[model samples]
Target: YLDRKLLTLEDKELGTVKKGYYQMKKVVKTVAVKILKNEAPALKDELLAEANVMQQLDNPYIVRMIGICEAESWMLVMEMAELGPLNKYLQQNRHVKDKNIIELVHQVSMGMKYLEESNFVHRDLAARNVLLVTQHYAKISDFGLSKALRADENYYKAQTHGKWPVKWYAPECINYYKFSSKSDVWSFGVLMWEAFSYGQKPYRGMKGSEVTAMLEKGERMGCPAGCPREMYDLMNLCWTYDVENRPGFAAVELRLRNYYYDVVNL
Candidate 1:
C-alpha cells in the first residue's frame, strides 16, 4: 500500500511524457505520473512492471523513480526532467554548439553503458526517450519496452510484434524481432544523428518500408551537414550491419570521451 505522502490531486500538470502520463512540479521535487485509463486492467500491470524495473536501476544518468500511487488511477511517480525529453529540447534550442551536443550524446552513452553492463536491453533507445535534467545533462528513461537478460541469453525474441520505430531499429531487429545490446547500439547511432541534426526526424520523409529496403542494401543516414567527421565515423561503427561487429556501449562511451577531449584541446 502506497501511503499518501504529500501528493495533491490538484497539482497542475506541467506537461505530458507519454500518452496518459503527465509531469507536475511539486514543492520539493518535480514528479511524473502515469495515470491509468479507465477499463484498462492490463495497462496497470504494465506500469507496475516498468516501476519494478525502474526501482532496480540506480544511476546518475538514469531517471529516478520516487514512488507510486495505487488507488483509483494507478499512478507512478518519477523524477521530473526539467528540460523534458531531449528531442524536444533540441528542437527549441537549435543554436546549441557542437561541444554541448557531444556532451549530451556522451551522457546517453554512459547511461546505456550502465544498462549494458547490467545486462538489460533497452528495446527502445532514441532521443525522444532520453530525458534532460538540464540542457547538458541527459538521463535515460522509459523502460516499458526494456528486458532483463538471463545469464545464458544473448538476445530476446519479441513475443508480440507491434508497430515499431523502424527508423531507429537495427536490420536484425526489424527482420528477426531480435533485441540485444547491439541493437541498442544501432538505435544510439540514430540518436546521434538526431542530436547533431537538432532533432530532425531520422530518414526524414521516408516511409518505414523504404527505410527497411534501404537498410537491407547497406544504406544508412548521411551524416548531418555540420557533424564532425570523427563523430560521424563513430556513428557508422554503431550501425555496422553485423551485430557482432558493432562496438559495445563501453567502447562507444570511451570514443565519445576521446572526442570530447580532442575538441577541448583544439
Candidate 2:
C-alpha cells in the first residue's frame, strides 16, 4: 500500500503507464498490476469500469481481480496468469495433447457458461483472450469488450461501427452489430479451431471482408487435421447460421466434460 521501487515518480509522469509484474502488498502474493498516468482521465475511467465489471466475476475459470489502487496513478491489480494468451501458448508448445486442448477449451466453455448466466456477453471471445493459468487449465480474461446486460435485456447492440474481430464474429455480429451468448458461442468455435490448429490465424490469408463474405455464403472453416470429428461437429453447430440453433455453453461445456471423461476411461 505504501511504496515500491519498480515504479518511480517519473514513471507516473508520462501519458502512458507501464504494467508491472508481481506487485502486491500484504501477505505478498503474485499479482499483475496495470497502471495509468494522471494525465489520462478518459483511459482511467475506462479501466475503472472494466475493473468494476471484473469485481462481480468469481470463477476458477475466470481471472480473479484482487483490487484496484489509486496512489497518484491509477492501478488495477489481479491474480497473474502463469502462461500468457492461449494462442501464443499453443504456438510455443508443439505437442499440447488433444485431451489437454479439450480440457482448456472446456474450461473456457465453463467460464463462458458463468458469463452467460451472469448476463455478461463476451464480445471478444477468442483464443487470444483465454489466458492459461496452467498448461491444461485456462481462464477467460481480456474483458475490454465485455458487456453486462440488464435483467430486461437479452442482447447488446452497438450504437455505431467500430473495429471488431470480424474473423471470429458471428454473422449477426458483423451484419447487425448484435452481441449475446450465442454470438460468443460462434467465437468459441473459432477459439476451438485456434487451439486445435495450434494457434493458426482464422481465415488464413483472408481479409475481414473476405471472411465476412464467406460467412455470408454459408461457408465455415473445416476442422484442423487430426482434430476429433466430434469436436469439429460441435464447431459446426456453433457456426450455425441461425443463432438460435447454436448450442449454448451449458451444452457445450457438458459435452466437452463428458468427452474428456470418456477418453480417459480406457
Candidate 3:
C-alpha cells in the first residue's frame, strides 16, 4: 500500500491518436496519459471522473489511484494491472479444469461482494473488467463506467451512459439502466459464461437488436459450451429473469466456496 505523491513524467506515444506516458510519481506506481483527441470534452470529463472515482476507492480488489492531471488533457496516473484481463487469461490457457474455473469464479465473486457491500455497482462487471494481478490475485479495474448505487436509486431501469455489449449486461441494465446488486448478479452470471466458454465471444451471430428483443422476452444465456452442470446451474440462478429472485453476492460466494470444498474432498 504505497502512497507516493503525484508528479508528471516524460510523455510518450503508445498508440495512434491517444498518446500516454509512464508516470512514476505515484504511490501505486503506474499512470497513463491520455491526450484528448481533438480536445474532446466528453472524453476529458470521463477521464477526470474516472480519476476522481479511482482515487476514492481503496479496496484491495479495486484499482488504486495516486493522482491525476486534468489541466491540459487529462493525464491519469494510477496503478496499472499487469496481468491483463480475465478474457485474455481464458484464451491463453486453451482449456481450464473445472476446479480452476470454479476458483476463478470465487475470486471474482469476492471482488463483486466487496463492491456490493460498499453500495457500489461496478456497472461493468465482466471478464474483460476483471484484471489479474497475478495467477491467483485479481482486481476489478475500469471504473469509468461505474455508478454508485444509492438507497433511493432505481434498481430496475436507471438510465446510464455506455453502450456495453448487452450480452454482458443484466436485462434490466440493458432495458432501463436501473442497476442494483441484483443486476450485478446477472452480469456475474454472464461472466461465468465467458469463463466457461473459454472467452468465446458472446451472442456469436445474434444482432444487438435481436439480442435485445430476445432478452426482453424472458430470454437468458444458456449453459456455456463446456461448463459443468453445477456451474451452469449457478449461472442460471444469477441470470434469473426475476431480479428479486436472483441470489446476492454472499450466496454466490458461499455456493462457490462450498463447491470448491467438495472438489477438494473428492
Candidate 4:
C-alpha cells in the first residue's frame, strides 16, 4: 500500500505546517500529505515515529492516516481536514457561540480520553495540534511529540531541554522534565483557554522565561472573558500545580460532556 502512492516533486507544496512539518497537495484527491523534512533527520524520525503511532489509533476524534509514502521524500497521507487547525478555525469564526465552543472542546477531550486509555501521552497537546473536521467536529493531530507508555511505565523523561513548550507544560514537566498523561491534562487547560479566547496566545505578552517563572510561582493564565464559570473551574482543575491533583482525561471528558449537554439543553 505504501508503494502505491508515491509523493513526487511534481506534487504542489501546500506550504509548511507545525514547526518542522510540511504539507503537499496530492493530484488525485483532496487528501493532504504531511512530509518529514529530509534536511532535519531528527525531525524526520519524529514524524515517522508519529506516523507509526497514528497507524495504531482508530477514533473519530483522531485524524485518520490513509497511507505512508516513501519515495525520495517520506510522507504520511491523511484525510484532509477541510477547516484546518482548530486555532485558525476559532479565529475565523470568532462569533462562534458558547455552546458550540463547548462542543468543540468536548470533542478534543474525547480524543484525549481515547489516548489516555490507550496509554499514550501526547507530549504536545494544544489547539494548534488539533484539526477541525467540521465546524463542530475536531480531531487531534500532530503527534510528533507523542509517546506510548507501557502499563507499568506511565511517564517519559525529557532527553532534551528548550524544546518543551513552557506555556502549555505542567510544572513537573518544566522543572523535572517528566511527561505523562497528567502533564497532558495540564496542556488541555491551556487548550481550553485558547479555544474560549478565540485562539488568543496563551500567557499573552509573556516570554518563555517569564511564563516559566510565573508557572513555577503558582500562576496561570486567567479564564477567557465570557467563559462559563463552571468551565473555567474545570480548566483550573486541569492546571493544578500538583500532578496528582489533576484529573485524568477520562474524568475531564465526562466533565466536558456534562457541560456540553447542559448548554445544549438550556
Clash totals in order: 0, 0, 5, 0
Question: Model 2: number of clashes?
Answer: 0
- Against the reference, the lDDT scores of all candidates come to 0.84, 0.82, 0.71, 0.81
State TM-scores per candidate: 0.92, 0.89, 0.82, 0.89
Order of candidates by TM-score, top first? 1, 4, 2, 3
Expressed as tens digits, the lDDT of each residue in 18-60 for candidate 2 is 3344434444555556666565347877888878889989988
Candidate 3, residues 157-188: lDDT per residue as tens digits?
A: 45554544677777767766677888888888
Using TM-score as the measure, name the better of candidate 1 and candidate 3.
Answer: 1
In model 1, the runs with Cα more than 4 Å from the true position are 9-27
Better of 1 and 2 by lDDT: 1
Error of 2 at 101 (Å): 0.4
Compare candidates 1 and 4 on TM-score and give the better one.
Answer: 1
lDDT of 1 by residue, 1-266 (tens): 34445554444554123222323353455466666666646777888888888888989999988877777577777877778878888889978889999998999999999999999999889999998888889999989899898899979898645545888989888889899999999999999999898888899888888998998898888989899999999989999998998999999999999999899889
Once model 3 is optimally superposed onto the true structure by TM-score, how far is the C-alpha of residue 33 displaced, in angstroms? 5.7
Among these predicted structures, which one has the highest TM-score? 1
lDDT of 1 at 81: 79
Candidate 1 clash pair list: none
What 10-residue stretch in candidate 1 is worst by lDDT? 15-24
lDDT (0-100) at residue 217 of candidate 1? 92
lDDT at 236, model 3: 81
